[PDB]
Amino acid sequence: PVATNGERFPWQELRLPSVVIPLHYDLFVHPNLTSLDFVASEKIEVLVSNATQFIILHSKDLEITNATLQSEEDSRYMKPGKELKVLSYPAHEQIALLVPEKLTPHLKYYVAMDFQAKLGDGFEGFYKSTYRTLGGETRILAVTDFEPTQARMAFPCFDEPLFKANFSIKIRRESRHIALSNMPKVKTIELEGGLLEDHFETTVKMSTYLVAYIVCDFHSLSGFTSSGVKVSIYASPDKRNQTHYALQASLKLLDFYEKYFDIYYPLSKLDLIAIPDFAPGAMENWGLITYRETSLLFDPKTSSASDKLWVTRVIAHELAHQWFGNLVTMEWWNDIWLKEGFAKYMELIAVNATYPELQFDDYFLNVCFEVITKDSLNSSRPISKPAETPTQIQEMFDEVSYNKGACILNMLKDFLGEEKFQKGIIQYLKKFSYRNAKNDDLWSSLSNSCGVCHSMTSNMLAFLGENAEVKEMMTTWTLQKGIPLLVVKQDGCSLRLQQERFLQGVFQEDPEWRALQERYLWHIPLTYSTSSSNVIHRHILKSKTDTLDLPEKTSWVKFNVDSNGYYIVHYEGHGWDQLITQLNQNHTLLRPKDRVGLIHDVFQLVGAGRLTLDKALDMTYYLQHETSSPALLEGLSYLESFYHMMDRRNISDISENLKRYLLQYFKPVIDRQSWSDKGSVWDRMLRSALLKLACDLNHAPCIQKAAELFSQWMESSGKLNIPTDVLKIVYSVGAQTTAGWNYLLEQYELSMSSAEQNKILYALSTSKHQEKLLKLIELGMEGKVIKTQNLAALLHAIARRPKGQQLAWDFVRENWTHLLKKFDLGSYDIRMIISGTTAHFSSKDKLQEVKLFFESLEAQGSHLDIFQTVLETITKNIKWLEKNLPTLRTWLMVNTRHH
Numbered sequence: 001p002v003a004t005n006g007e008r009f010p011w012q013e014l015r016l017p018s019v020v021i022p023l024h025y026d027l028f029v030h031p032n033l034t035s036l037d038f039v040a041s042e043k044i045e046v047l048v049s050n051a052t053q054f055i056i057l058h059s060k061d062l063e064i065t066n067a068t069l070q071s072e073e074d075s076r077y078m079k080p081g082k083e084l085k086v087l088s089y090p091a092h093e094q095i096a097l098l099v100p101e102k103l104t105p106h107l108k109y110y111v112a113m114d115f116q117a118k119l120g121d122g123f124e125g126f127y128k129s130t131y132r133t134l135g136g137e138t139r140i141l142a143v144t145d146f147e148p149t150q151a152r153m154a155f156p157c158f159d160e161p162l163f164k165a166n167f168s169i170k171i172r173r174e175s176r177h178i179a180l181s182n183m184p185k186v187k188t189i190e191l192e193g194g195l196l197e198d199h200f201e202t203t204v205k206m207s208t209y210l211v212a213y214i215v216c217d218f219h220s221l222s223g224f225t226s227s228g229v230k231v232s233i234y235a236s237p238d239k240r241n242q243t244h245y246a247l248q249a250s251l252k253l254l255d256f257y258e259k260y261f262d263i264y265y266p267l268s269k270l271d272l273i274a275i276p277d278f279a280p281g282a283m284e285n286w287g288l289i290t291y292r293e294t295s296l297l298f299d300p301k302t303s304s305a306s307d308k309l310w311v312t313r314v315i316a317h318e319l320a321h322q323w324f325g326n327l328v329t330m331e332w333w334n335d336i337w338l339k340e341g342f343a344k345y346m347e348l349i350a351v352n353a354t355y356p357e358l359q360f361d362d363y364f365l366n367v368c369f370e371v372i373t374k375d376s377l378n379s380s381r382p383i384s385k386p387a388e389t390p391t392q393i394q395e396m397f398d399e400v401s402y403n404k405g406a407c408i409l410n411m412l413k414d415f416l417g418e419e420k421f422q423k424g425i426i427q428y429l430k431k432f433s434y435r436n437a438k439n440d441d442l443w444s445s446l447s448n449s450c451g452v453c454h455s456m457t458s459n460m461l462a463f464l465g466e467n468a469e470v471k472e473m474m475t476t477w478t479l480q481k482g483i484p485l486l487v488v489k490q491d492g493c494s495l496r497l498q499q500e501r502f503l504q505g506v507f508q509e510d511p512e513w514r515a516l517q518e519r520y521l522w523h524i525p526l527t528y529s530t531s532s533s534n535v536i537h538r539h540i541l542k543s544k545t546d547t548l549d550l551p552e553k554t555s556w557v558k559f560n561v562d563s564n565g566y567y568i569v570h571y572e573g574h575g576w577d578q579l580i581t582q583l584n585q586n587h588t589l590l591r592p593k594d595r596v597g598l599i600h601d602v603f604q605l606v607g608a609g610r611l612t613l614d615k616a617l618d619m620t621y622y623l624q625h626e627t628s629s630p631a632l633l634e635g636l637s638y639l640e641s642f643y644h645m646m647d648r649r650n651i652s653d654i655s656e657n658l659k660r661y662l663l664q665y666f667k668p669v670i671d672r673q674s675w676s677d678k679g680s681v682w683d684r685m686l687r688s689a690l691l692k693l694a695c696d697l698n699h700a701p702c703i704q705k706a707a708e709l710f711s712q713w714m715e716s717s718g719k720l721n722i723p724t725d726v727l728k729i730v731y732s733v734g735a736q737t738t739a740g741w742n743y744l745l746e747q748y749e750l751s752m753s754s755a756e757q758n759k760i761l762y763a764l765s766t767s768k769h770q771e772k773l774l775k776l777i778e779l780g781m782e783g784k785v786i787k788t789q790n791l792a793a794l795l796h797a798i799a800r801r802p803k804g805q806q807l808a809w810d811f812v813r814e815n816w817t818h819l820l821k822k823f824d825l826g827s828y829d830i831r832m833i834i835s836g837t838t839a840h841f842s843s844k845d846k847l848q849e850v851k852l853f854f855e856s857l858e859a860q861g862s863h864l865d866i867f868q869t870v871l872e873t874i875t876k877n878i879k880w881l882e883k884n885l886p887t888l889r890t891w892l893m894v895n896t897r898h899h
């Protein structure tokens with residue numbers, strides 16, 4: 001089990017021996033931003049338990065040049081000797097430190113190494129980033145990104161979340177630079193040559209993936225919380241203005257989270273720094289949180305209502321991690337959702353609490369719908385499943401871990417109620433502070449929520465029974481893949497309930513469907529309301545089938561009130577008809593989230609072949625009266641979806657009819673829109689949606705409006721200004737001339753708004769010229785004018801639209817090698833590049849090609865779950881078209897007639 005020039009490597013597991021156990025690291029790093037590298041060294045106070053000949057820990061791409069043990073309890077290693085022999089098994093990113101004489105139980109020793117390496121050159125470990133100044137200058141910073149397994153690319157350690165420890169960090173630097181790390185700075189000291197050296201307050205107990213340090217020359221804005229925590233928003237100097245909103249919201253939000261969890265944030269300061277080159281959206285390192293400029297920065301003149309909602313959200317996400325993830329940490333990456341689902345969920349609670357005007361409560365169903373898409377394919381996974389290779393650990397970062405997790409926690413809250421939930425949370429956070437937990441601990445804590453507690457009455461047995469229930473439930477949502485379908489049959493006053501595993505591109509008669517129905521069973525906290533009583537009823541379906549006896553007995557029944565539950569409902573008989581009828585005469589007699597869920601569920605059942613397209617399309621008629629935007633837009637998103645799908649083949653008869661129905665219907669609401677930023681958030685959102693829809697449908701009035709604004713813009717040389725909500729429409733419209741497009745690219749290079757840049761680069765990719773599009777990709781790869789962290793989204797933008805899906809696929813296939821040199825296999829970048837270029841395919845031809853490309857990609861050694869997922873998805877598409885394309889042709893053709 002062995003290499004690196006001979007000799008046995010003592011340990012043979014991917015995991016680390018749990019014999020050694022570190023407690024404290026003294027970490028000294030000295031990076032040079034001219035030579036672009038670092039020398040550095042460390043001192044790890046370990047505590048041996050079992051006695052041992054060897055000590056094992058992680059390292060990767062670090063050159064180790066000195067190694068010593070040293071102890072204060074075990075005399076044989078009294079100061080300062082002795083030297084250790086260094087054994088390096090790379091294929092498990094491990095090293096072995098060879099001790100001269102077996103170590104002694106219950107004695108603390110001290111492992112010391114000097115190591116060096118070059119500054120990294122992509123998104124992980126300790127890497128180089130650059131930024132442009134308003135002057136046109138290029139500057140360099142050096143930043144860490146360790147999650148999940150790249151701490152070890154920076155300093156050797158016990159690089160698994162369970163080994164928490166205290167960290168002590170010194171950084172040496174010039175004086176053009178400052179130096180940030182997790183904790184605040186205790187001491188700066190002047191050195192002989194002239195260099196400075198920073199000393200940071202030893203951290204609390206914490207995991208390696210959270211360790212951080214930066215050497216830049218940024219500016220900040222600071223402020224203090226209630227509890228007297230110092231918050232600072234760092235950014236490169238010319239963008240300090242754009243840090244205001246982040247300061248405001250982070251403040252309100254840390255205030256909130258302290259209250260809600262009833263735990264103070266422990267560190268004295270909290271920094272939020274906007275890194276120019278940054279792969280994920282943000283990384284939540286304790287006290288030093290990193291962000292993509294677009295996750296943090298904000299500027300009234302160019303970023304939009306939606307942008308503000310995004311920034312709020314990400315800031316809400318990262319702070320929640322400080323408790324959910326940083327304070328309490330998952331025991332191992334199998335339960336990453338413990339961190340990531342709670343943080344996603346706590347987005348909703350906190351932003352609603354602190355910023356209800358952002359109206360973010362309405363938006364959160366999208367979070368849940370989005371997962372159902374993948375969770376309804378066979379290739380899905382359970383929320384919590386095993387993982388080992390770093391590439392698998394990187395794969396756990398996906399809608400299941402995030403959205404689905406958040407979603408069932410939203411289910412569970414509706415069950416137990418806010419006050420109970422909050423209690424259970426607060427307990428979990430307290431009982432596990434400064435250490436770790438696993439799936440089961442959360443349930444136990446959340447189930448055993450709070451007389452009874454804590455110092456023998458009736459209904460006190462119901463509590464410990466109801467508790468065991470609540471735990472028994474959630475176990476099934478975390479270890480079972482997919483989402484359940486609840487079928488409801490109305491029979492006078494008898495409602496019968498069937499439970500099924502919702503599949504898609506798989507029909508109830510199809511040969512495969514019945515094997516895929518396996519042992520799947522859920523405890524589904526059902527809810528419902530009736531046309532006769534808006535009073536909400538609740539019942540736990542713990543089995544394959546069951547029956548409820550309705551009082552009054554009335555027109556329709558509505559299961560999943562407001563969609564708080566992770567299930568889809570079907571209506572056999574006349575339910576779907578009753579409901580669409582009710583939807584058509586007094587839709588107001590149906591709750592808005594019930595509407596948003598019906599429109600969702602309806603179209604999702606055409607997917608399963610448990611309804612035909614013409615029912616769905618016949619529901620959308622009521623949209624002309626529909627006034628709640630969440631519902632108007634969900635509906636509108638389906639027809640728009642269709643159109644784009646048609647357009648992607650030549651299906652011009654269907655597309656042109658879709659276009660016509662879209663402009664004809666909805667013409668009233670399309671026409672009330674201002675080319676302004678006025679109104680609510682959902683008001684502003686609705687505006688951009690329609691105006692975009694219109695401008696994509698060549699509705700020549702709105703193309704003229706846009707092309708005017710663009711012109712006024714380009715002639716005034718930036719002086720004349722375009723409202724944010726309309727900014728992307730206008731830019732894309734202008735981008736059709738080689739003149740506008742030329743101007744736009746040039747304006748991209750000079751902009752200081754990361755959000756304007758975003759909007760421009762979208763506009764640039766709505767060019768019809770093959771030549772244009774390709775250049776973008778090239779520039780993207782090169783990574784000087786357009787940062788490579790934007791490559792994936794870019795390809796996806798391009799591939800998305802007719803003139804580009806070919807070019808995209810072509811490029812990805814022909815460049816797989818180069819792409820990998822830029823991103824981990826591995827990365828969300830590669831995942832999004834693969835599926836963004838293939839998953840919209842809907843032809844047997846394209847499916848053929850994709851199956852090959854992935855086939856190829858296995859041996860050479862490359863396996864990613866996303867391969868099968870894509871396949872299943874293109875399949876669903878083919879099967880969708882063939883099983884409903886004619887119905888769409890017909891429904892539309894029927895519509896041109898009456899009336």
Ligand SMILES: COC(=O)[C@H](Cc1ccc(O)cc1)NC(=O)c1ccc(N)c(NC(=O)[C@@H](N)CCCNC(=N)N)c1
Pocket residue numbers: 145146147148279280281282283284314317318321397398399400401402403828
């Ligand atoms: C461009 O990345 C995105 O926009 C992300 C990526 C992602 C997409 C789908 C998904 O299911 C999970 C993650 N999408 C999200 O919904 C998201 C929004 C805000 C965040 N702060 C985050 N990330 C976090 O809190 C961190 N734990 C990130 C891991 C750090 N990575 C690293 N060290 N290599 C994610």
Ligand SMILES: *[C@@H]1O[C@H](CO)[C@@H](O[C@@H]2O[C@H](CO)[C@@H](O)[C@H](O)[C@H]2NC(C)=O)[C@H](O)[C@H]1NC(C)=O
Pocket residue numbers: 031032033034035172173174193194195
């Ligand atoms: C990084 O290395 C550079 C060498 O390129 C150091 O800069 C030199 O510093 C010495 C004394 O501080 C000067 O006499 C040289 O003239 C400098 N060279 C240049 C090109 O400016 C720099 O100090 C190092 N920084 C760190 C943090 O180690």
Ligand SMILES: *[C@@H]1O[C@H](CO)[C@@H](O[C@@H]2O[C@H](CO)[C@@H](O)[C@H](O)[C@H]2NC(C)=O)[C@H](O)[C@H]1NC(C)=O
Pocket residue numbers: 024165166202203204205434
């Ligand atoms: C390592 O971290 C812990 C915190 O995780 C440090 O502090 C102890 O933490 C508890 C828990 O909050 C506090 O109540 C104690 O007051 C802390 N100890 C003391 C002595 O005050 C611990 O001190 C850290 N170790 C080092 C060497 O700094």
Ligand SMILES: *[C@@H]1O[C@H](CO)[C@@H](O)[C@H](O)[C@H]1NC(C)=O
Pocket residue numbers: 049050051
């Ligand atoms: C040493 O660790 C083993 C497991 O690795 C454990 O079973 C044993 O109890 C420990 N030794 C002693 C003497 O306790």
Ligand SMILES: *[C@@H]1O[C@H](CO)[C@@H](O)[C@H](O)[C@H]1NC(C)=O
Pocket residue numbers: 240241
């Ligand atoms: C920020 O913008 C305001 C005008 O809105 C201006 O007065 C101020 O000087 C700007 N600050 C920086 C650092 O650009």
Ligand SMILES: *[C@@H]1O[C@H](CO)[C@@H](O)[C@H](O)[C@H]1NC(C)=O
Pocket residue numbers: 348349352353356361
């Ligand atoms: C949003 O906040 C309001 C009060 O601000 C509260 O009544 C409501 O329950 C919250 N919604 C959610 C989904 O938490």
Ligand SMILES: *[C@@H]1O[C@H](CO)[C@@H](O)[C@H](O)[C@H]1NC(C)=O
Pocket residue numbers: 378379512
């Ligand atoms: C569905 O998934 C299971 C396990 O993930 C697998 O064994 C089976 O082959 C899959 N079914 C199809 C049709 O691919």
Ligand SMILES: *[C@@H]1O[C@H](CO)[C@@H](O)[C@H](O)[C@H]1NC(C)=O
Pocket residue numbers: 586588
């Ligand atoms: C039905 O719709 C009408 C539309 O004018 C509305 O006035 C009425 O309030 C609705 N029904 C009920 C019971 O409120």
Ligand SMILES: *[C@@H]1O[C@H](CO)[C@@H](O)[C@H](O)[C@H]1NC(C)=O
Pocket residue numbers: 650
């Ligand atoms: C289909 O569209 C392509 C371009 O996408 C065009 O060149 C071709 O002529 C069209 N074919 C038919 C039969 O309409």
Ligand SMILES: [Zn+2]
Pocket residue numbers: 317321339340343
């Ligand atoms: Zn997160």
